Design an enzyme around this catalytic site. Structure first.
Site, short mmCIF file in Angstrom:
data_model
loop_
_atom_site.label_atom_id
_atom_site.label_comp_id
_atom_site.label_asym_id
_atom_site.label_seq_id
_atom_site.Cartn_x
_atom_site.Cartn_y
_atom_site.Cartn_z
CB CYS A 1 16.64 3.81 1.58
SG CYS A 1 17.64 3.50 0.12
CG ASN A 231 19.48 -0.18 -1.29
OD1 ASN A 231 19.99 -0.64 -0.27
ND2 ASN A 231 18.98 1.05 -1.35
N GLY A 232 21.93 1.20 -3.44
CA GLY A 232 23.31 1.57 -3.21
C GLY A 232 23.81 2.62 -4.18
CG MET A 479 52.12 22.09 9.49
SD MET A 479 50.86 21.68 10.71
CE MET A 479 51.87 21.22 12.10
CD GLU A 886 41.10 11.36 14.94
OE1 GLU A 886 40.07 11.03 14.31
OE2 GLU A 886 42.25 11.21 14.48
CE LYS A 937 45.55 12.15 8.73
NZ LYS A 937 46.53 11.27 9.41
#
Ligand SMILES: Cc1cc2nc3c(=O)[nH]c(=O)nc-3n(C[C@H](O)[C@H](O)[C@H](O)COP(=O)(O)O)c2cc1C
Ligand code: F3S
Lengths: 1472, 153, 116
Positions: A1, A231-232, A479, A886, A937
Site C-alpha cells: 500500500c 490512500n485511506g 453489566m 488488559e 461497548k
C-alpha cells in the site's frame, strides 16, 4: 500500500521523473500482501504526462502528417470474451468523437506481456487499446480539455444505455495518461514495456498501490483515477451521495451549456469511495476552480477558535465550510490539475506523508522517506505534512508553494471578509427575544397521560434523566445486556429500539472525543444550499446555529424569526381510522409537504402537538424519514429545511437517529416539561431552572459527539441524512422504501404491527385512569417489567448445582433456561438430524471437549486479585486456556506455586492503552490477542473509576494512584489494514511461538474485514456478541450498540469459505452462552472454540447486583477494597464442575443426534431448521440469510494446519548468526550493517533472545551495539530491552521505539549533510507508543502524536508536531523547538520542558489538566542540564551545544509543564 | 575574542599579567567620550557562538552589557594592510589581489613582469620573521637561477 | 564482569618455546608456527636485559634482568618430515584448532609452500 508523487519544480520534462517514479514503485513490496502464488497482485498504477513525440512518430510511421498543436490519446478497456461487443463499443466511441468535429488518427493495440499475471486476475482481464484524436479545429487547449471531458461523459452514458459490461475509459486527454492494472507493484514495467522507451519524459508523475480486502480483482477499480490518487478510506460516503443527489438539481455553469443535461447523475453506480470523490473533484475543477481551491472546499481544515492563524484564512475557511459538506476519513491525497500538482492531508492527519527537496529542482513526496535513492549531499530540506496541510507546485510558472505561502496566495483572489458578514446567529435573537410570552406548563394529569402514551416509566426519570440535569453527563452501567431483542418482546418498545448504531473496525479508526475535541463541530445552517458552481454573496447569507438541539424558548424565537415562510404539518392519525390508517396518514403528510414546498415555503415544521383522546401520534422517526425521502426523490430537498418537535425524546439515542435520518433540528418539549415539573417539587436542590436546562443541553451535545465519534465522522453536517445505523426487526420493503440507505438482513414487522402496538399503547394511556407511571424494568429486574436472561431461580439453581456437584441439578437449571419463551435469535432454531442415535459412551471424552472452552479476558482493574487468580488457577488445571485481559498482570505469578497451581494466564491481551505491555509480558504466553472492540461497548475504550485504582494497580499499570483511566478509542497504531499487518508482524517477531488473535464485534459488513485480516497472517478470529458483560460503560452504548453474534459468525464463515481462506484460520465466539444447546448451535454455525465469561463469575458467587463500577460489590468479586475482598467465597473446583457439566451436556446432545465428534458437526448447517412462534405474532423473520450453506470444495470446513502462519525473515536473523559469543559467553559485541526502508522490526528478535536468556534487566546499558546507515524501515527496535543500543545515521520511517523496555535508540543525520538539525524532520509518526523504560535521542523534529502513552521513557528531540505527549503517564521529555496544537492533551503523569523562543506556548497548549510555568528550583535545572548534556554527547548535535554554551541567558526561555494531579505528590515541590 | 585565541604567543600574556596589566576579554570598542581630547572609552561586551562546521565562531553583541572605562591615552593597534604599489611605483601593471599582496609563482617567486622579483612580508600578510627569512632565501635561489639562464642566453 | 574478554584467539609456537604449556595450547581457536619473521628473516627475536622485569621473568620462566635472544632455528624443524611431525603433534594436543605456517617472501618460496 502507498501513494506518491514526483515533480520537477521548474516545470520542464525529463526522463529522470518517470525513471524515479518506476524506481519508487519497485520498492513498496513489503507493505503489500504476499501470496503463495507469487504472480497474483491486487492493483498498481502510474499517471504521467503525454509524450507528444512518441505518438507523433507513430502517426508519421502510419502515413499521416504530424500536426503542430498537441495530440490527444485515450486508453480504453474493452470486453475480451465476445468479438462483437468490441465492435459495438468501437462504433459508439467513433460516432461520439466525430460528433463534435475532431479528427481521428486511428487505434493502437498496447503491447503487453501476459505471462506474469496470476490465475484470477487473468480470467477477467480486459482488452487494452488506445485511440488517437487530433485537434484540427484550431481551438484552444482548455476548450480542448473541456470538449474531451464532455465526450467521455457522453460516451460513458451511451455505453451504459445498451447494457454492455466490461467497458472503461482510463483516461482521455491531451495532457496526461494513466497506466494501471492488477499486476504486482514491481512487475509494472514488465507488463507495460512502453515505459521502458527513452521518449517517455514528463514533468510530473504519480504512483499508487492498494491493499484489497477480498480476492476478486476488477481492473477498472485500480488507482490512480482521472485527476486524483487517494490512500485511506472515506467515512461519509452514504451521507455525501445523498447531498450530491440534492445538489445536482440546481447546479449549472455557462461553460458546459446544453450538454449540462448530460452531466446530471454525476456519481455513477458501481464505484468506490475514491472514485466518487474523484468524480465530484473533476466536475468541480472543470467548471473554473483550481486544484487547491477544490481541495480546500471538499476536504477542509479544522476551524479552530484560536488566534494562531490570521483572520484572512479564517474567513476563507469559513466560506469553504459554508459552501459544501466535508468528505471525512483518513486520507492522503496526491492530486493534479492540468496546471498544479498538490499533495494534501485530511483534518486529523492519520496517514503519513513525507517529502524531500533536492538541488536539481525536484520534489519527491510519498508514504516513506527511503523509496528513491538520493545522496545526502544534495538535499535542501526534509519535511512532513501536518493535519490539514498541503504543498503545491505551480508548473505553468515553476514555483513551489508550501502551506502558509499557498494559503496567503490563495486568500487574495476574492474578498471573503465582506462576504462572510452576511450570516446571522441565534443567541443574539434569543437575547433580543424579550422575556415575555412564556406559556403555562401542562398539568400533572396531562403530563402523565402524555407520558403513558409512549411507555415512559418512573425509572426513565430517576435513573437516566436525573444525572443529566444534576451533573451534565450520561449515566454509567456495569453489566451486559440480557434483555430480549426489540421484535421478540411483548411490551411497548419504541421504534428507536430497532436501530442499532454503527462503528469502525480495523479498516477505520474511531476518534477520541474527550481529548481531540477541537476538530469536532456541531454547527447547523438554515437556508444554505444553492448553486455550488458560482461565486457570489448570496451563498453566505443564512441562519447559523451552534447546536442542532433547541430548547423551547430558542425554538419559539426561531419560529418568530422565520415568520410566514414556514409550514406546520400535522403528524397524527385517527385511532378509529381502520386497519390502514397509518399508511393513509403517511401518504397524506408526504403529499402535503410537497404541496407546501412548491408553494414557496422554505421551512417545514413537523409538529405532533395535536395528540388527543381520538388521535394517535405517528412515530417521529418514520414520519421524518418518509418526508425527507420524498423531498429527496422529488428534487425539492435543496429548497427547505426540516425541523421536528417530538414528544418521545428523553435520551441521547433518540436525537441521534432523528438527525441521522435527515431532520435538521430537533426540539424535545416533553422532556423539558418533565424537568420543570420535577424542579418545582424541589428535587434538584437549589439550582435554578436555567442551570438544569443548560446542563441537559450540554449532556445531549456530549452524547451526540460520543455517538458520532464511534464511526470517525467529525462533523454533524456530513453525518445528517446518511443513515449510519442498522435496522434489525423491520421489513425489507418498509426499510427500502422509507429509509434512505440501510440494511435489514432479516425481515421484520410491517406497518400493521407498528399500528397495532401504537394503538394498543394509546388505548392503555387514554382509556383508563392513570394514577402513577409504571415502575418498569428495563435496566433492573422487576416483576412488572420485561423478562431477563438472568433471573433469581436460574442463578440460585446454578449456584447450588455447582457447589453440591450434582449433575441432576445442573440439568434442572438447563431445563429452566431452555423452557422460557424465545428471547434471542438462537431460540427460533431447532436441531433435527436424520441418522440413528448412538450410545452416549462412544462420543469424544470429556477432556477432549473441555479443552475447547476458554474464559474471556477480565482486566485486573475490574476484578479483584483473588477472582483473577481463581479463574487462572481453575483453567490451567483442566488443560484449557485462560485470559488476562488488559491491565497487565503481576510478574511474581510467572511461576507455578509450591502446591502445584499455575497462577499465570495462557493468553495475553494487547489493548489500546498498552497498559502493562513490556518485553517480558509478551514472552510468557502461548497466544497473543489484539483487542479491537469489546462486546458491550464497541468503538470505545474501557473505563476504570478513580477510587478503583489503588497503589497495587498503580504500580501494575505504571500510572498515578487515584485518577480515572480511560483508554483511547483508537489504537494510534492501527489506522488501516496495512497497519494491522505491521502490528501482527511485530507481535510475531517478538514471540516466536505464540498465535495472534484478532477480536471483533458482529455487525453488517464484517465478512470483508474478516477476509482481509485473514490475509494479514492472523490465525484466530474472535466474534463477540452484543450481550457481553463489562466492568463499566454508559447505558446508551450497552443497550443500543452491536448485533447478535449469530449474524456476524454466520457471515464470517460464509465469506471465508467463499475466498478459499477458511481452512487457514480458526473461529471463536462468545457472548450469552449458558447451556450446551447454544454451544452446539454455535458449533453448527461455524465456530470451533467458545468463550464463557459471565457464567464463570456466577459460579463463583456473583448474583448480578450490577454495582461493579461503584466499588461496593457485596460478594467481593469486582472490588478493590479490603473489607469487601475479605468476603470472597470462590473456589476453582466450582469452575471445574461448571465446565465439566457443560461438556457432558454437549456429549449428551451429540450422542442424541447421531455423531461422535464436534468435527463432524462444524459447518453442517443443514441440521438447523426454523420454527415460527405461532399464528398470533405474525413476525416475518426469515433466518435463511444465516442458514445459507456455501459448498467448500476439496478443502475441509475447519482449520487443517498445525503451527502459526510464518512470516518472512528480517535482518535480525543475520544478527543472530553473528552475535553468538554474546549468547554463549556473555561478552560485549559491536556490529555494523546497512539499513533499508524495506526492513521492518530491526532488532526485535534479538530482544526476544536477550529477554529469554538474561531478562529485561540482566545486562549493563550498552552491552551490544548496532550501527545502521541509511533510512531504517518501520518499527525500528520495537520492544527492545536494556543492553541493546541501536544507532542510526539517517532517518527512520515510523513507529520508532514502539514498546521500548529499557533499550537505547540514537538517531542523527549523517556527517556529510548540509542540513540544519532543528529544521528537518528525522523520525515519523507515533514515536515511543507505550514505552515503559529507556532512552531515545533524536537530532531533528519528530512527527505526529509524539510520545503517546509514554510511561517511563526519557526522550530528547529538537521539535514536534500536533498532539504531542498525548496522554503521557510517566517520564521526562525535552523539546528544543516549536510544538503543534493540542499539546499535552490528557497528560496525567511526568514532566515536560519546552525551549520556546517566540513566546507562543500559551497559544498552543491545552491548559485543561496541566500547568506551565518557569523553572525556579535548581533541582529541576540540574535535570535539564544533565539531559541536554547527554544528548550532546550521544548525538553530537550543534544546536543543543549552542544552547548549552549560553546557559545563563537561555535558561530563562524554558517552559516547564507539570500535570495537575502531581502537584501534591512530588518530593521536591516545584514552587517556592 | 577569547584568551586562547590570542594571535601572538602564550608566555607573553603570562609575562604581561605578572608585570601588572589588566586584561578585558571579549570586548569591542563602541565610542570615545570627551570634548577635545579623549576622556573615556564606551565599550560593549560580545558573546562568541560555538565553532561552525568549518572552524569559525560568529560573535554577537550583548544588548544589555555596555560599560565605560576611563582612558587618558588610547592606542589603536588594529593591524596593517599593504599599500598601493602599482600607483606608487609608476608600474600600474603589477598583478595584485584584493588585499594588496601581489601575486607570484610558487617556484621562482617571480612577479608578473620578468626580471622583477618580490618575496617576504608583502606577500603573506601579518606573518613572522622566520617566514620572511624563508621567503628571502627562496627568492635568492630563484633570482640566481634566472640570472644564470639570462646571462647564458 | 563488563563483558570485556582479554583472551587471544591465535597462539604462537615460536622458536624459544617461552610459554608453551599444556594449558596455553587449549585456550585458542588456531595455532601458529613462526619459522621466520618479516623484518629479520633467519634470526631470533631479541629482548634487552632491562626489558625483562619480574613479571616477564616469572611469565616466561626465566631469570629477571637477562638478555633473551631466541635461537634462529627451532631444534625441532630440521627438514620437512620434522615439520610434518610437529604439525601432527599440534593437531593431536588440540582437537579443534588449525595450524598456520608463517613464511617470508623471497625466491623459491613456491616449492616450499607446495611442500608445506
Ligand atoms: C467485569 C468484566 C470485565 C471485562 N473486561 C474485559 C476486558 O478488559 N477486555 C475485553 O476484551 N473484554 C472484557 N470483558 C468482556 C469479556 O471478555 C467477554 O467478552 C464477555 O464477558 C462475554 O460475555 P458473556 O460472559 O455474557 O458471554 C469484560 C467483561 C466483564 C463482565
Ligand atoms: S454483577 Fe458485579 S456488582 Fe458484584 S455481584 Fe456480580 S461482581
Amino acid at each position: 500500500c502507498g501513494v506518491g508523487f514526483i515533480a520537477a519544480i521548474d516545470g520542464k520534462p525529463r526522463r529522470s521523473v518517470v525513471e524515479k517514479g518506476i524506481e519508487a514503485l519497485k520498492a513498496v513490496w513489503h507493505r503489500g500482501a504476499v501470496d503463495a502464488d507469487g504472480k497474483t497482485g491486487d492493483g498498481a498504477g502510474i499517471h504521467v504526462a503525454v509524450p507528444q513525440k512518441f505518438f507523433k512518430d507513430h502517426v508519421k510511421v502510419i502515413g499521416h502528417r504530424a500536426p503542430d498543436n498537441k495530440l490527444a490519446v485515450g486508453q480504453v478497456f474493452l470486453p475480451r470474451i465476445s468479438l462483437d461487443a468490441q465492435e459495438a463499443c468501437r462504433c459508439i466511441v467513433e460516432t461520439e468523437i466525430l460528433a463534435f468535429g475532431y479528427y481521428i488518427y486511428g487505434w493502437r493495440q498496447v503491447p503487453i506481456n501476459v505471462d506474469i499475471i496470476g490465475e484470477k486476475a487473468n480470467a477477467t482481464r480486459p482488452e487494452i487499446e488506445q485511440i488517437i484524436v487530433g485537434n484540427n479545429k484550431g481551438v484552444s487547449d482548455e476548450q480542448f480539455e473541456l470538449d474531451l471531458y464532455i465526450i467521455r461523459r457522453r460516451i460513458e452514458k451511451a455505453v451504459k444505455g445498451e447494457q454492455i459490461n466490461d467497458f472503461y475509459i482510463c483516461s482521455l486527454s491531451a495532457r496526461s495518461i494513466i497506466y494501471k492494472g492488477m499486476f504486482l507493484a514491481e512487475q509494472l514495467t514488465t507488463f507495460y514495456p512502453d515505459l521502458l522507451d527513452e521518449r517517455f519524459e514528463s514533468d510530473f508523475a504519480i504512483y499508487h498501490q492498494r491493499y484489497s480486502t477480498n480476492t476478486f480483482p476488477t481492473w477498472p477499480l485500480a488507482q490512480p483515477f482521472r485527476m486524483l490518487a487517494h490512500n485511506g478510506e472515506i467515512n461519509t460516503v452514504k451521507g455525501n451521495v445523498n447531498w450530491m443527489k440534492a445538489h445536482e438539481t440546481r447546479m449549472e455553469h455557462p461553460a458546459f451549456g446544453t450538454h449540462m443535461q448530460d452531466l446530471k447523475p454525476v456519481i455513477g453506480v458501481g464505484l468506490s469511495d475514491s472514485g466518487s470523490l474523484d468524480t465530484v473533484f473533476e466536475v468541480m475543477v472543470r467548471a473554473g476552480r483550481t486544484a487547491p481551491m477544490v481541495k480546500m472546499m471538499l476536504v477542509p481544515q479544522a476551524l479552530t477558535s484560536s488566534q494562531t492563524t490570521p483572520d484572512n484564512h479564517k474567513a476563507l475557511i469559513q466560506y469553504c465550510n459554508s459552501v459544501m459538506e466535508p468528505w471525512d476519513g483518513p486520507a492522503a491525497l496526491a492530486m493534479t490539475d492540468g496546471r498544479w500538482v498538490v499533495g494534501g492531508m485530511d483534518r486529523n492527519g492519520l496517514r503519513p506523508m513525507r517529502y524531500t527537496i533536492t538541488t536539481d529542482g525536484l520534489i519527491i513526496g510519498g508514504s516513506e522517506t527511503g523509496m528513491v535513492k538520493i545522496d545526502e549531499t544534495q538535499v535542501i530540506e526534509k519535511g512532513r505534512l501536518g493535519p490539514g496541510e498541503m504543498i503545491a507546485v505551480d508548473l505553468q510558472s515553476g514555483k513551489l508553494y508550501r502551506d502558509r505561502e499557498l494559503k496567503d496566495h490563495l486568500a487574495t483572489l476574492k474578498p471573503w471578509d465582506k462576504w462572510v458578514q452576511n450570516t446571522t446567529h441565534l443567541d443574539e435573537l434569543v437575547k433580543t427575544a424579550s422575556l415575555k410570552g412564556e406559556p403555562s406548563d401542562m398539568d400533572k394529569a396531562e403530563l402523565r397521560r402524555r407520558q403513558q402514551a409512549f411507555g415512559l416509566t418512573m425509572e426513565d426519570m430517576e435513573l437516566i434523566l436525573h444525572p443529566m440535569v444534576e451533573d451534565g453527563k450520561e449515566a454509567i452501567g456495569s453489566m451486559g445486556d440480557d434483555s430480549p431483542i426489540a421484535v421478540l418482546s411483548d411490551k411497548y418498545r419504541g421504534l428507536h429500539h430497532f436501530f442499532r448504531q454503527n462503528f469502525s473496525q480495523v479498516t477505520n479508526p474511531p476518534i477520541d472525543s474527550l481529548r481531540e475535541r477541537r476538530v469536532m463541530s456541531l454547527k447547523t445552517r438554515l437556508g444554505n444550499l444553492g448553486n455550488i458552481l458560482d461565486e457570489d454573496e448570496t451563498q453566505t447569507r443564512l441562519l447559523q446555529l451552534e447546536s442542532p438541539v433547541l430548547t423551547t424558548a430558542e425554538f419559539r424565537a426561531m419560529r418568530d424569526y422565520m415568520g410566514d415562510t414556514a409550514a406546520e404539518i400535522d403528524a397524527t392519525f385517527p385511532v378509529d381510522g381502520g386497519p390502514e390508517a397509518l399508511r393513509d396518514a403517511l401518504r397524506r403528510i408526504r403529499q402535503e409537504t410537497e404541496d407546501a414546498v412548491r408553494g414557496g415555503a422554505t421551512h417545514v415544521i413537523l409538529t405532533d402537538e395535536a395528540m388527543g383522546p381520538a388521535r394517535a401520534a405517528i412515530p417521529a422517526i418514520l414520519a421524518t424519514g418518509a418526508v425527507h425521502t420524498h423531498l429527496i426523490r422529488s428534487n425539492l430537498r435543496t429548497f427547505t429545511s426540516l425541523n421536528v418537535r417530538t414528544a418521545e425524546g428523553l435520551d441521547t439515542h433518540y436525537f441521534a437517529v432523528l438527525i441521522g435520518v435527515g431532520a435538521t433540528t430537533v426540539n424535545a418539549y416533553l422532556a423539558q416539561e418533565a424537568i420543570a415539573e420535577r424542579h418545582r417539587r424541589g428535587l434538584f436542590g437549589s439550582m435554578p431552572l436555567e442551570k438544569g436546562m443548560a446542563n441537559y443541553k450540554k449532556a445531549i451535545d456530549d452524547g451526540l459527539l460520543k455517538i458520532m465519534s464511534k464511526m470517525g465522522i467529525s462533523v454533524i453536517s456530513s453525518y445528517r441524512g446518511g443513515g449510519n445505523f442498522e435496522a434489525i426487526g423491520l421489513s425489507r420493503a418498509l426499510v427500502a422504501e422509507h429509509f434512505p440507505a440501510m440494511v435489514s438482513r432479516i425481515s421484520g414487522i410491517g406497518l400493521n404491527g407498528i399500528q397495532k402496538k401504537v394503538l394498543e399503547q394509546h388505548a392503555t394511556a387514554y382509556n383508563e385512569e392513570v394514577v402513577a407511571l409504571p415502575v418498569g424494568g428495563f435496566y433492573r429486574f422487576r416483576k412488572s417489567g420485561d423478562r431477563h436472561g438472568w433471573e433469581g431461580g436460574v442463578i440460585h439453581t446454578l449456584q447450588q448445582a455447582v457447589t453440591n456437584d450434582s449433575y441432576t441439578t445442573f440439568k434442572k437449571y438447563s431445563e429452566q433456561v431452555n423452557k422460557r419463551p424465545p428471547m434471542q435469535l438462537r431460540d427460533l432454531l431447532e436441531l433435527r438430524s436424520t441418522k440413528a442415535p448412538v450410545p452416549v459412551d462412544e462420543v469424544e471424552s470429556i477432556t477432549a471437549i473441555r479443552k475447547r472452552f476458554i474464559t474471556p479476558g477480565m482486566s485486573m482493574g475490574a476484578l479483584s486479585p483473588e477472582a483473577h487468580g481463581t479463574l487462572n488457577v481453575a483453567m490451567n488445571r483442566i488443560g484449557a486456556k485462560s485470559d488476562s485481559g488488559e491491565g497487565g498482570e503481576d510478574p511474581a505469578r510467572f511461576r507455578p506455586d509450591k502446591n502445584g497451581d499455575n497462577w499465570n494466564s495462557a493468553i495475553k491481551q494487547v489493548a489500546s492503552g498498552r497498559f502493562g505491555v513490556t518485553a517480558e509480558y509478551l514472552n510468557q504466553c502461548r497466544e497473543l490477542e489484539i483487542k479491537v472492540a469489546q462486546g458491550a461497548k464497541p468503538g470505545e475504550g474501557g473505563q476504570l473509576p478513580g477510587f478503583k485504582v489503588t497503589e497495587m494497580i498503580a504500580r501494575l499499570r505504571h500510572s498515578t494512584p487515584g485518577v480515572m483511566l480511560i483508554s483511547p478509542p483508537p489504537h494510534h497504531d492501527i489506522y488501516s489494514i496495512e497497519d494491522l499487518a505491521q502490528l501482527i508482524y511485530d507481535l510475531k517477531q517478538i514471540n516466536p511461538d505464540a498465535k495472534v488473535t484478532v477480536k471483533l464485534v458482529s455487525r453488517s459488513g464484517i465478512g470483508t474485514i474478516a477476509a482481509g485480516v485473514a490475509k494479514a497472517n492472523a490465525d484466530i478470529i474472535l466474534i463477540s456478541g452484543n450481550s457481553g458483560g463489562t466492568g463499566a460503560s454508559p447505558q446508551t452504548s450497552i443497550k443500543f450498540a452491536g448485533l447478535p453474534w449469530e449474524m456476524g459468525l454466520s457471515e464470517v464463515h460464509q465469506v471465508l469459505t467463499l475466498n478459499r481462506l477458511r481452512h487457514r484460520v480458526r473461529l471463536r465466539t462468545d457472548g450469552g452462552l449458558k447451556t450446551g444447546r447454544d454451544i452446539v448451535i454455535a458449533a453448527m454455525l461455524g465456530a470451533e472454540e467458545f468463550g464463557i465469561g459471565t457464567a464463570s463469575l456466577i459460579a463463583m458467587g456473583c448474583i448480578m447486583v450490577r454495582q461493579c463500577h461503584s466499588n461496593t460489590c457485596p460478594v467481593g468479586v469486582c472490588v478493590q477494597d479490603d473489607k469487601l475482598r475479605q468476603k470472597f467465597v470462590g473456589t476453582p473446583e466450582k469452575v471445574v464442575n461448571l465446565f465439566t457439566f457443560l461438556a457432558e451436556e454437549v456429549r449428551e446432545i451429540l450422542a442424541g443426534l447421531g455423531f461422535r465428534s464436534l468435527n463432524e458437526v462444524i459447518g453442517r448447517t443443514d441440521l438447523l431448521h426454523q420454527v415460527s412462534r405461532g399464528a398470533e405474532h405474525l413476525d416475518d423473520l426469515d433466518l435463511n440469510p444465516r442458514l445459507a450453506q456455501v459448498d467448500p470444495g476439496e478443502n475441509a470446513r475447519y482449520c487443517t494446519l498445525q503451527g502459526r502462519n510464518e512470516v518472512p525473515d528480517t535482518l535480525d536473523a543475520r544478527i543472530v548468526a553473528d552475535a553468538r559469543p554474546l549468547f554463549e559467553e556473555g561478552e560485549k559485541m559491536q556490529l555494523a550493517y546497512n539499513a533499508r526502508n524495506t526492513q521492518r522490526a530491526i532488532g526485535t528478535r534479538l530482544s526476544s533472545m536477550v529477554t529469554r536468556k538474561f531478562g529485561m534487566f540482566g545486562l549493563q546499558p550498552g552491552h551490544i551495539t548496532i550501527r545502521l546507515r541509511g533510512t531504517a524501515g518501520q518499527s525500528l527496535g520495537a520492544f527492545a530491552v536494556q543492553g541493546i543500543k541501536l544507532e542510526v545515521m539517517g532517518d527512520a520511517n515510523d513507529y520508532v521505539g514502539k514498546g521500548l523496555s529499557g533499550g537505547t535508540i540514537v538517531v542523527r543525520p549523517t556527517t556529510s549533510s548540509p542540513l540544519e538539525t532543528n529544521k528537518n524532520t528525522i523520525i515519523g509518526n507515533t514515536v515511543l507508543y507505550g514505552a515503559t523504560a529507556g532512552k531515545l535521542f533524536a537530532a531533528g523534529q519528530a512527527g505526529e502524536r509524539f510520545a503517546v502513552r509514554n510511561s517511563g521513557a526519557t526522550v530528547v528531540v529538537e521539535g514536534c508536531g500536533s498532539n504531542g505527549c498525548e496522554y503521557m503517564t510517566g517520564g521526562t521529555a525535552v523539546i528544543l523547538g516549536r510544538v503543534g496544537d493540542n499539546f499535552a492533551a490528557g497528560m496525567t503523569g511526568g514532566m515536560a520542558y519546552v525551549y520556546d523562543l517566540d513566546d507562543s506556548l500559551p497559544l498552543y497548549i491545552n491548559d485543561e489538566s496541566v500547568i506551565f510555568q518557569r523553572i525556579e528550583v535548581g533541582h529541576y535545572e540540574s535535570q535539564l542540564k544533565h539531559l541536554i548534556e547527554e544528548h550532546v554527547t550521544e548525538t553530537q548535535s550543534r544546536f543543543a551545544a549552542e544552547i548549552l554554551n549560553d546557559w545563563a541567558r537561555e535558561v530563562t526561555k524554558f517552559w516547564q509543564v507539570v500535570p495537575k494531579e502531581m502537584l501534591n505528590r512530588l518530593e521536591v515541590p516545584v514552587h517556592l | 575574542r577569547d584568551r586562547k585565541n590570542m594571535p601572538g604567543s602564550q608566555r607573553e600574556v603570562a609575562h604581561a599579567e605578572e608585570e601588572g596589566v589588566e586584561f578585558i576579554w571579549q570586548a569591542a570598542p563602541e565610542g570615545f567620550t570627551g570634548d577635545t581630547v579623549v576622556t573615556g572609552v564606551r565599550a560593549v561586551r560580545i558573546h562568541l557562538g560555538v565553532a561552525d562546521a568549518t572552524g569559525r565562531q560568529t560573535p554577537q553583541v550583548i544588548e544589555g552589557s555596555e560599560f565605560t572605562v576611563q582612558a587618558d591615552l588610547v592606542i589603536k593597534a588594529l593591524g596593517f594592510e599593504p599599500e598601493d604599489l602599482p600607483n606608487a611605483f609608476d608600474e600600474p601593471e603589477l598583478k595584485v589581489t584584493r588585499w594588496g599582496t601581489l601575486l607570484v609563482d610558487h617556484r621562482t617567486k617571480m612577479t608578473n613582469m620578468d626580471g622583477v622579483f618580490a618575496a617576504g612580508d608583502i606577500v603573506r600578510g601579518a606573518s613572522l620573521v622566520v617566514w620572511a627569512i624563508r621567503d628571502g632565501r627562496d627568492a635568492a635561489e630563484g633570482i640566481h637561477a634566472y640570472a644564470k639562464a639570462k646571462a647564458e642566453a
